[PDB]
Design a protein around this motif. Structure first.
Motif, short mmCIF file in Angstrom:
data_model
loop_
_atom_site.label_atom_id
_atom_site.label_comp_id
_atom_site.label_asym_id
_atom_site.label_seq_id
_atom_site.Cartn_x
_atom_site.Cartn_y
_atom_site.Cartn_z
N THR A 150 -3.38 8.70 5.31
CA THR A 150 -3.76 9.59 5.36
C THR A 150 -3.34 10.97 5.24
O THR A 150 -1.89 11.10 6.16
N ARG B 153 0.57 -1.56 0.00
CA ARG B 153 0.19 0.08 -0.11
C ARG B 153 1.20 1.42 0.45
O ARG B 153 1.65 1.48 1.42
N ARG C 16 -2.88 6.16 14.62
CA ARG C 16 -3.07 6.77 13.73
C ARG C 16 -4.16 5.89 13.12
O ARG C 16 -6.01 6.04 12.86
N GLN D 188 -9.06 5.38 13.78
CA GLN D 188 -9.91 5.24 12.60
C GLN D 188 -11.00 4.10 12.28
O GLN D 188 -11.59 4.41 12.45
N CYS E 287 -1.71 14.23 6.56
CA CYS E 287 -2.22 15.31 8.31
C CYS E 287 -2.65 17.05 7.24
O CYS E 287 -3.22 17.33 8.44
N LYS F 186 -10.26 1.90 4.10
CA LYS F 186 -9.72 2.87 3.69
C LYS F 186 -8.04 3.62 4.32
O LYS F 186 -7.89 4.36 4.14
N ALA F 187 -8.51 2.53 5.83
CA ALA F 187 -7.70 2.11 6.40
C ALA F 187 -6.54 1.93 6.00
O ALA F 187 -5.48 3.07 6.62
N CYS F 188 -6.35 1.38 5.51
CA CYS F 188 -4.74 0.58 5.01
C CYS F 188 -3.82 -0.02 5.58
O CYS F 188 -2.85 -0.02 6.47
N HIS G 206 0.08 4.40 -0.48
CA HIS G 206 -0.58 5.88 -0.51
C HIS G 206 -0.74 5.56 1.32
O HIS G 206 -1.88 4.64 1.59
N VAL H 125 -6.07 10.30 2.49
CA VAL H 125 -5.12 9.49 1.98
C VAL H 125 -4.55 8.90 0.71
O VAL H 125 -4.69 7.98 -0.07
#
Ligand SMILES: [Zn+2]
Lengths: 89, 154, 135, 51, 131
Positions: free
Chosen positions: A17, A13, D7, D11, A19, D49-51, A15, A24
RNA sequence: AUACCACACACAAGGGAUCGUUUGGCUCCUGGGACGAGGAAGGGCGCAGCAGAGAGCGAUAUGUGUGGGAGCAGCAGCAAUG
RNA sequence: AAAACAGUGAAAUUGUGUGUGGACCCGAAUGGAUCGGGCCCGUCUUGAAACACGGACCAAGGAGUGCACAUACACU
RNA sequence: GUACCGAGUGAUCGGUGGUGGAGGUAGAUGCAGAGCAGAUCUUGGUGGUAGUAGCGAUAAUUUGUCUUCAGCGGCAAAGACU
């Protein structure tokens, strides 16, 4: 083959989130956000007029700007305990 | 309230109706078709034989590619069937009208099935996955039912 | 209702039995439900009706128009005029020899009574006389 | 999995509290016109989409 | 004719102003006429109806009836009057609400601040009447 | 053609056209043209007696002062000591 | 993206009852067998019933308009 | 909106009886986003085909007993498999 069997390997993955903007879209290896250009000082150029109006002033809450307009209407009166400082100034 | 599809007197008749039933439309009207104008005790006896594979339901309108059978000769055709799920429902429905008849003060005999009709209810949607990444429909087709039985003048 | 114009009484049946009952249905309105019965002239390059082959139907035209004297005449031998007020009948007072009145559909019961009373005294024929006011 | 950052956890916690139907008393209120909460989700049908 | 151009005459605007009213503007909607005698007992011609006051119904199904005001519904603009009701299939009885303007006041409830409310309005008149 | 297929009419199904209505849109005119290191615009998270979304508000999450004045939409409780 | 009134409730399409026929239209009739005439529309084309193409069915939407500049006609 | 009946060569127009429950025309002129069978047209709804094609690669399943109210569901005893 390039269809269904190659889909099985797609478990990394790139990308996370951001700040500054929430979207995202922070690319971890490049060190850059694709929505808002963080960490650059200015915000990114938005691609077209349709897309930029979605993030303008007035799309959120405008907390400070609303209060300022009400205070200007009233003649900037201030806290009534401290009228003497205001009047001298 | 319900507007039954024909006009027969409240005295000397008994009635029932149901909506959105989850028995299959095309199977149910082939059942209803054959028991029209039959006497109620005869109807209940016949439907018991169908459940035991001793007699069959003949088919006339929804009948393409159906099997041939020696039991169909009783109605002058070759083609017949055994739709167990629809038969169990109709049998229960008819038995309840004999309770109503008895309680209402008509006889348990000389009652004849004068009117019976089936209608299509709205579809319930479903899906099946196919080849080459396609999706196709897989829906269900329920029904509505009315019956009126009357006492023979004789 | 069984009434007749007195000037045509001995002729009206000849007139009535002489009227055509021909219909001019639109071509192929019998084949698909999306085409209504209302006449439209065919304009195709190949079309068998436009080209007037024997066995195709007939098309409208001036030859079929009725004689000027007979035209517009109802089967009772009068022509019709529409009315909606008491003050309308006042127009017919000179013409009652050849014209009759037909009260418009939207005029209600209480008003119709007032129209019919006036029609009786002036001597004017009203063709919707029974109307809604049968009860 | 078992390893998470702070983080990512917040979420998930927020996404779990929001996932509820309309409480049964609100339906009785004179002015209230909603039928079902259109923001309800299932883990089988959508990604956070917390991933 | 209207000669002031700051006031609207649009149907769309007048209707929105009615239904979205709040506060004191909402109270203005609940006004009713006083009877001829009370218009000599007090200066006022009309007042906002409150619980406990006594009213004659002058229009509708319950015409000619008299009774005490039980409740005031501000959101759906209606008043419930003692003994004006309908009976359900169950035999259970439900009070039917009447629109303020179909009522007329016969006796005033003088509980709480009512006497001061009336005084405030009488003075406001005279202040300009006498000038 | 006893029962299939077609058409017509009455009744029951199936769908949402038409007519009646509108606290919305669009156009023209007039006013306005008021942000931020005293931390903005934009993002996140918390706060209700029963409370998901949205609205309102910041651990003071319905506080103080002035002008008014009757109820708080459901259920339980509050309110001229507002 | 869709989704207005807890109004009205068309057509396609389905079941039951009653009638009339075996694809249907036009002309003319019987108590009753039927008689005569008609190939599938739209479109390009010297030429279409075509072994030329588009069309399963119904509703609703759906294509010569506005401005500027010279112009001939009709009217003031 | 739906059945019938009349008027017109025709585009269309009028009446009668049920349904519906609040608005609607006739004459003379003005302004137009002003009339559909077709475009492998756009959106939504529905057929015939059809109770048909298919739904069953892999180790395998039987008996009793309780629920379930009619789940080869659970539990005992066998038979198999990785
Ligand atoms: Zn960013």
């Amino acid at each position: 083959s390039k269809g269904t069997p190659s889909n099985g390997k797609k478990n990394k993955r790139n990308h996370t989130t951001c700040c500054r903007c929430g979207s995202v879209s922070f690319h971890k290896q490049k060190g850059k956000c694709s929505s808002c250009a963080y960490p650059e000082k200015k915000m990114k150029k938005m691609q077209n007029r349709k897309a930029m109006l979605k993030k303008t002033t007035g799309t959120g809450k405008m907390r400070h700007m609303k209060k300022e307009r009400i205070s200007r209407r009233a003649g900037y009166p201030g806290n009534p305990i401290l009228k003497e400082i205001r009047n001298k100034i | 309230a319900h507007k039954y599809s024909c006009d027969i007197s409240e005295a000397t008749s008994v009635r029932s109706q149901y909506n959105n039933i989850k028995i299959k439309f095309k199977n149910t009207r082939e059942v209803c078709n054959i028991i029209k104008t039959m006497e109620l005790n005869k109807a209940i006896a016949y439907l018991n034989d169908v459940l035991r594979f001793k007699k069959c339901i003949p088919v006339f309108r929804f009948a393409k590619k159906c099997g041939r059978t020696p039991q169909a000769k009783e109605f002058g055709t070759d083609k017949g069937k055994w739709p167990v799920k629809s038969v169990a429902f109709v049998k229960k429905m008819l038995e309840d009208l004999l309770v109503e008849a008895e309680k209402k003060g008509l006889g348990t005999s000389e009652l004849v099935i004068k009117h019976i009709q089936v209608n299509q209810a709205p579809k319930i949607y479903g899906r099946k996955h196919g080849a080459f990444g396609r999706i196709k429909p897989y829906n269900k087709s329920p029904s509505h039912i009315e019956v009126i039985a009357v006492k023979r003048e004789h | 209702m069984d009434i007749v114009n007195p000037s045509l009484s001995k002729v009206i049946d000849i007139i009535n039995k002489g009227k055509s009952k021909k219909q001019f249905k639109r071509f192929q309105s019998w084949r698909v439900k999306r085409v209504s019965e209302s006449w439209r002239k065919p304009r195709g390059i190949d079309n068998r009706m436009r080209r007037k082959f024997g066995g195709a139907p007939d098309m409208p035209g001036i030859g079929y128009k009725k004689p000027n004297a007979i035209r517009f005449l109802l089967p009772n031998g009068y022509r019709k005029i529409m009315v909606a007020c008491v003050k309308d009948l006042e127009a017919l007072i000179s013409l009652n020899s050849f014209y009759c009145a037909e009260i418009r559909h939207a005029v209600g019961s209480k008003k119709r009574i007032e129209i019919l009373e006036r029609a009786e005294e002036l001597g004017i024929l009203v063709i919707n006389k029974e109307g809604k006011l049968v009860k | 999995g078992s390893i998470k950052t702070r983080r990512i956890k917040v979420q998930l916690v927020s996404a779990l509290k929001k996932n509820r139907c309309i409480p049964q008393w609100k339906r009785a209120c004179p002015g209230f016109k909603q039928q079902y909460n259109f923001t309800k989700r299932s883990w089988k049908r959508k990604t956070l989409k917390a991933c | 004719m209207k000669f002031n151009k700051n006031v609207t005459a649009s149907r769309r605007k007048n209707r929105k102003a009615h239904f979205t009213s709040i506060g004191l503007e909402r109270t203005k909607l609940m006004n009713a006429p006083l009877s001829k005698d009370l218009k000599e007992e007090y200066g006022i011609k009309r007042i906002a109806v409150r619980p406990g006051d006594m009213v004659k119904v002058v229009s509708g199904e319950f015409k000619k009836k008299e009774g005490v005001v039980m409740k005031v519904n501000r959101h759906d603009i209606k008043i419930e009057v003692e003994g004006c009701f309908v009976q359900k299939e169950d035999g259970k009885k439900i009070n039917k609400g009447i629109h303020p303007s179909n009522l007329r006041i016969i006796k005033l409830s003088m509980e709480k601040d009512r006497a001061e409310i009336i005084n405030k309005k009488v003075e406001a008149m005279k202040s300009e009447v006498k000038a």
